Design an enzyme around this catalytic site. Structure first.
Site, mmCIF file in Angstrom:
data_model
loop_
_atom_site.group_PDB
_atom_site.id
_atom_site.type_symbol
_atom_site.label_atom_id
_atom_site.label_comp_id
_atom_site.label_asym_id
_atom_site.label_seq_id
_atom_site.Cartn_x
_atom_site.Cartn_y
_atom_site.Cartn_z
ATOM 1 N N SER G 105 0.523 -1.125 0.259
ATOM 2 C CA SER G 105 0.097 0.500 -0.001
ATOM 3 C C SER G 105 1.202 1.268 0.132
ATOM 4 O O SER G 105 1.353 1.532 1.303
ATOM 5 C CB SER G 105 -0.913 -0.492 0.930
ATOM 6 O OG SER G 105 -1.915 0.747 1.221
ATOM 7 N N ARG G 106 0.883 2.030 -1.398
ATOM 8 C CA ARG G 106 2.505 2.945 -1.612
ATOM 9 C C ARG G 106 1.291 4.230 -0.008
ATOM 10 O O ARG G 106 2.669 4.750 -0.187
ATOM 11 C CB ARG G 106 2.421 3.203 -2.764
ATOM 12 C CG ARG G 106 2.870 2.978 -3.673
ATOM 13 C CD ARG G 106 2.980 2.379 -4.976
ATOM 14 N NE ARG G 106 2.922 1.930 -5.693
ATOM 15 C CZ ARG G 106 4.465 1.360 -6.419
ATOM 16 N NH1 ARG G 106 5.581 2.259 -5.513
ATOM 17 N NH2 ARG G 106 5.232 0.040 -6.861
ATOM 18 N N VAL G 107 -0.094 3.885 -0.036
ATOM 19 C CA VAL G 107 -0.361 5.215 0.480
ATOM 20 C C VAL G 107 -0.141 4.618 2.355
ATOM 21 O O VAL G 107 -1.024 3.493 2.455
ATOM 22 C CB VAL G 107 -1.804 5.648 0.807
ATOM 23 C CG1 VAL G 107 -2.529 6.431 1.784
ATOM 24 C CG2 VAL G 107 -1.702 7.234 -0.684
#
Lengths: 160, 253, 66, 123, 280, 123, 140, 123
Positions: G105-107
């Site tokens: 999850s890049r966020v």
């Protein structure tokens, strides 16, 4: 064939034992003690003032340059006294004391535990256990009780 | 040819599992090697005085076969593998020094099969110590109670000596017979005290102090110091097992 | 006495050690040294192809070899 | 009957290459490492120098006759030559040339032992 | 049918020159209908149609022991059974190089006669355990189970070059499935059979208590094929022929065989076992 | 619960052939050996002969009810049947037929034992 | 979306029936554009644009835990992370059968709340050591 | 020559890092733990702050030239700056500027010493 490719070294050579000489000089001022249980030592060549053993013939004491001797150790306690007046007691399980004329002690034992790690309370139950074993008529348990009492009674009198 | 790629993928995933397996053997090995290295710091002291009694000049092997009647060998092997050439060099040594009047009661599971297949009749049995607890003096006494069954004339214990992490060589203890050791002690106690081999310690005052020692105590002196010799063999081969296995594990990786 | 009963001096020492490990207090010392008194080993002698126990010498200290 | 065996032994050695390259020689039963020590000998014995490749190998080319090939493989197959080392079978033809190569190897090994001896004594 | 892959390669050579569209692995695509049109003609006709038949034994080449190619999969999809010949077994010394775990037949007992049913019903159960244990290196050299014995002797009996009469196979496998050939070693299993079929020992040595059951007449097939071995009047004669063949072999021949040490006679015996492996 | 428990067992069973094929059964805890035994028993228990495959197997098939197919798996799940050997599960029906097979294997075990005694005394 | 791989299969069926030029795995060229026309419509808009938001949870079906397939290799390159499930864990009572190593999850934190950041900071520093320990330790 | 020496140093430190896990840091020789300390200084010295995040994190960014970096790494390799602690090299740039951090750390340590001494002497 290959002419004996292997050549295993005699392992005894790895140890450096003393050369007990007849003595062409004076005596040292303090014994060089080296206590060893099964494989590992607790004390390696420590300078010590005196030591008191318990043997089958009786209770012995040693100083620097004591007469050359070798003998058993009764299952009991062992007292040691450094040059600083203090003391150190060790509960032992048999062994062989090796005293020298040069003044050197090599006490090879099976077990060596300080008194601090022992409780009289746990010894108390084991006393009557040993007595019941001795009174139980059986060659397999009688001698086991006689030996258990043989090791508790020195502790029983050393604690009190 | 959709099958060849699945065959190669499957071999890849098999090796990928085998990697973490051997990594788990590695870490489990280091968990006991860190536990057992402590002996190295407290090493080489419990037989500082035993050697002075039982050590001897470098005896020939062709002479003792003629003097003796029934030799004995205690090769200490291992229970589980991935060790190295330990059991192999220990087998090549016995067949290198093989001779008609011998018998082998070994230790470890690999000497169960290897000795029986290379040494048909001379090998008899072995002892197995599950390594859930460190060795004990009583285990070496159990080994002496196995050795005493045979009327052996000289017992050559063989083991692996850990000189360092990159040095797990062979080593031996030559144990004379109890009666023959007492005869050597009586013959030595009379004559002048002179060492017959470089690096050998004089022992005449000891052999006389023991000459005063009674029969039962001298027999306990012998069974005791031979028990310590056997126990040092076990502790050293255990350390060599846990020391060479890591090399024969990282090479597998 | 215990000598003539048939037990050895080595069984005597191991019995004494096994008794001493019981009485000493609980700590890392006992936690280590009980390893030096627990009996877990065995003996085996190889048959033609099968394994069998050479039980001529018991590991327990109360018994007598024969 | 000789070639049928020769194929069979190499067939087993191939199965063991997947393990020996994983574990090693020391992790095998005595039967297996024997068969390996014999199949390495056979496969090395399968090589020979040709008269054409004298430029490459720098060795005189041999002409192995049929009868001496079968007598050699049959002897090597029944363990008639097991004490002989592995490298003596490399790039040669005829067992007599093998045993002369083994003689040269043993001679050179002894010569290096005398040479290391004298080098140690002078040192 | 010899190589059907070549019958598809020709179909490809034609269709592609005819500017038909290729498909998987360059074939036209409808090659499955080719092999189906061919093989479904193979059948057992009803008694209305004479009860005739025609069996098909098509042969298909394989490359690197794969069954993943297009043609091999379209053919196995059609055929009832398949006889996988593994080069790893061919090169392994044994011939014919069938791998039984990979090769099957979707007919089973209903094909073979009354006698072979009772045998194969035991052989399948035998190999089911031997295949699980034969991966183990034999360490119980005397405690090896009867299964590890019988399975290996059975594999040795499977070694052939030419065909064998029916009579000359059922007795050879009955000797193993009941354990009669468990005392002799593995290598001499075929020479044991060579005598069991061509050199009747009890007829030579006078141990003749069997009234009729002897392996020389060669027409007893037509009775085994009808009654079967597990019968009132063939079981005991069979037992009182095989136990004698075993005794005479273990006493006269095996005793001589283990006593050879010379290389000149050793080689001669080895080549004799190989000859018996071939002719039988 | 019984179906998900069994599948979780077999999920670990694969991870144990990952290890047993390399090291052996000896390098695993008794709690690991127990689930291995259970899983291998489930793998052989779930087999079944069918009356249609009488041509192939030569053995009568069993019609096992669903309800009977739960108290037998759960029994194996909680060690109700751990003393029962391995091959009693292979190619059988309900647990009644399992114990009926274990009695037979033990009967022919005593058969081979008494025949071994009679062969030792006789020869 | 349940699911995009069948959307790609349909686009394949149409292009190939329309005599369009195929490419890898018989898909046409613009399939990566076919998805990028769609997913990039998912966004968090600005307060100037209503502050609206469109969250996309595209499902895609792998085959034998492969990810080098063309569709999956493209959708992963598009999305702002992924979730990787394993059937080896769905059978082992780990339901949902996530695979935390491959899941991304890049966020990481900026989406989470004030209550979650302090927790996830511990959980990352717990599972990071769990995997090393469960991987190196034995089974028993 | 500086860059390739740093490479050989870091490679050697990686090997000793793959050995310390086996034996222990004390097992190494006097020269080995020397280069280990130097590598632990180097890898921390590679860490550099940035003028980008100066508003974000507060720390300043240092634009180190080429020639100044060579003289710094050559000093760090020649052993003439080893007494400086490891943490001083963390997240700084230029050997002329790390010593400001080193002196600031020594002064802060002496401040905590004088604070603990007066806190104990007062009571």
């Amino acid at each position: 064939q290959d002419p004996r490719k292997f050549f295993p070294d005699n392992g005894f050579r790895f140890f450096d034992g003393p050369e007990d000489s007849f003595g062409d000089g004076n005596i040292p001022a303090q014994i060089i003690l080296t206590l060893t249980r099964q494989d590992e030592f607790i004390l390696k060549q420590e300078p010590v003032a005196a030591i008191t053993i318990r043997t089958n013939e009786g209770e012995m004491g040693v100083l620097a340059g004591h007469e050359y001797t070798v003998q058993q150790l009764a299952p009991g306690i062992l007292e040691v006294e450094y040059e600083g007046g203090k003391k150190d007691q060790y509960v032992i399980s048999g062994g062989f004391a090796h005293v020298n004329d040069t003044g050197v002690v090599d006490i090879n034992t099976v077990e060596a535990v300080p008194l601090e790690e022992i409780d009289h309370e746990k010894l108390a139950k084991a006393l009557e256990e040993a007595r019941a074993k001795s009174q139980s008529p059986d060659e397999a348990v009688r001698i086991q009780g006689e030996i258990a009492l043989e090791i508790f009674e020195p502790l029983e009198a050393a604690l009190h | 040819g959709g099958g060849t790629i699945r065959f190669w993928r499957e071999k890849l995933e098999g090796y990928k599992k085998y990697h973490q397996i051997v990594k788990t053997i590695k870490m489990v090995t280091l968990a006991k090697y860190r536990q057992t290295v402590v002996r190295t710091r407290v090493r080489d002291q419990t037989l500082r005085y035993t050697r002075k009694a039982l050590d001897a000049k470098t005896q020939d092997d062709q002479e003792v076969i003629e003097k003796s009647e029934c030799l004995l060998y205690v090769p200490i092997t291992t229970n589980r593998g991935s060790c190295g050439a330990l059991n192999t060099n220990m087998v090549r040594y016995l067949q290198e020094v093989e001779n008609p009047k011998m018998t082998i009661i070994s230790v470890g599971k690999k000497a169960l099969d290897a000795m029986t297949k290379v040494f048909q009749d001379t090998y008899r049995r072995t002892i197995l110590n599950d390594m859930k607890q460190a060795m004990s003096f009583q285990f070496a006494a159990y080994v002496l109670e196995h050795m005493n069954t045979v009327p052996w004339d000289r017992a050559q214990i063989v083991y692996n000596r850990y000189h360092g992490a990159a040095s797990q060589k062979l080593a031996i203890f030559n144990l004379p017979k109890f009666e023959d050791w007492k005869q050597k002690l009586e013959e030595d106690s009379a004559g002048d005290g002179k060492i017959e081999e470089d690096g050998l310690l004089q022992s005449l005052p000891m052999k006389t102090a023991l000459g005063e020692l009674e029969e039962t105590a001298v027999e306990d002196f012998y069974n005791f110091h031979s028990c310590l010799a056997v126990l040092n063999a076990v502790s050293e081969n255990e350390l060599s097992e846990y020391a060479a296995r890591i090399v024969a594990v990282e090479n597998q990786l | 006495s215990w000598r003539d009963a048939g037990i050895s001096y080595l069984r005597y020492l191991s019995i004494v050690t096994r008794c001493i490990h019981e009485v000493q207090k609980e700590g890392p010392l006992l936690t280590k040294n009980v390893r030096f008194s627990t009996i877990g080993w065995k003996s085996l002698y190889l048959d033609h192809g099968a394994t069998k126990e050479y039980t001529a010498i018991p590991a327990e200290l109360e018994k007598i070899p024969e | 009957n000789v070639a049928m065996d020769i194929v069979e032994m190499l067939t087993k050695y191939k199965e063991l290459q997947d393990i020996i390259a994983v574990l090693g020689i020391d992790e095998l039963s005595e039967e297996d490492k024997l068969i390996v020590d014999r199949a390495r000998k056979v496969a090395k014995f399968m090589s020979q120098p040709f008269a054409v490749a004298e430029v490459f190998t720098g060795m005189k080319g041999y002409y192995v006759q049929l009868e001496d090939c079968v007598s050699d493989f049959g002897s090597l197959l029944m363990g008639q030559c097991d004490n002989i080392p592995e490298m003596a079978f490399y790039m040669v033809g005829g067992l007599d040339s093998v045993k002369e190569k083994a003689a040269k190897m043993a001679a050179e090994a002894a010569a290096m032992r005398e040479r290391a001896r004298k080098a140690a004594e002078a040192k | 049918y010899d190589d059907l892959s070549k019958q598809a390669v020709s179909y490809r050579q034609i269709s592609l020159l005819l500017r038909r569209p290729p498909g998987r692995e360059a074939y036209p695509g409808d090659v499955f209908y080719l092999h189906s049109r061919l093989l479904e003609r193979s059948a057992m006709m009803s008694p209305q149609k004479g009860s005739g038949s025609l069996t098909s034994l098509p042969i298909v080449e394989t490359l690197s022991n794969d069954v993943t190619a297009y043609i091999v999969t379209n053919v196995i999809s059609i055929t009832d059974g398949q006889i996988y010949l593994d080069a790893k077994l061919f090169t392994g010394g044994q011939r014919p190089a069938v791998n039984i775990g990979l090769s099957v037949s979707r007919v089973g007992s209903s094909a073979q006669n009354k006698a072979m049913k009772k045998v194969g019903g035991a052989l399948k159960m035998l190999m089911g355990e031997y295949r699980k244990m034969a991966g183990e290196q034999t360490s119980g050299s005397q405690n090896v189970s009867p299964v590890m014995i019988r399975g290996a002797r059975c594999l040795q009996l499977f070694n052939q070059k030419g065909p064998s009469y029916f009579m000359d196979a059922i007795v050879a496998l009955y000797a193993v499935t009941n354990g009669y050939m468990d005392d002799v070693k593995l290598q001499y299993s075929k020479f044991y059979e060579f005598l069991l079929l061509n050199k009747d020992l009890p007829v030579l040595y006078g141990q003749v208590n069997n009234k009729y059951f002897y392996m020389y007449n060669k027409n007893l097939n037509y009775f085994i094929r009808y009654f079967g071995l597990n019968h009132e009047i063939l079981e005991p004669e069979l037992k009182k022929y095989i136990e004698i063949h075993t005794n005479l072999f273990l006493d006269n021949y095996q005793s001589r065989m283990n006593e050879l040490k010379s290389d000149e006679d050793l080689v001669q015996l080895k080549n004799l076992l190989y000859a018996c492996k071939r002719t039988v």
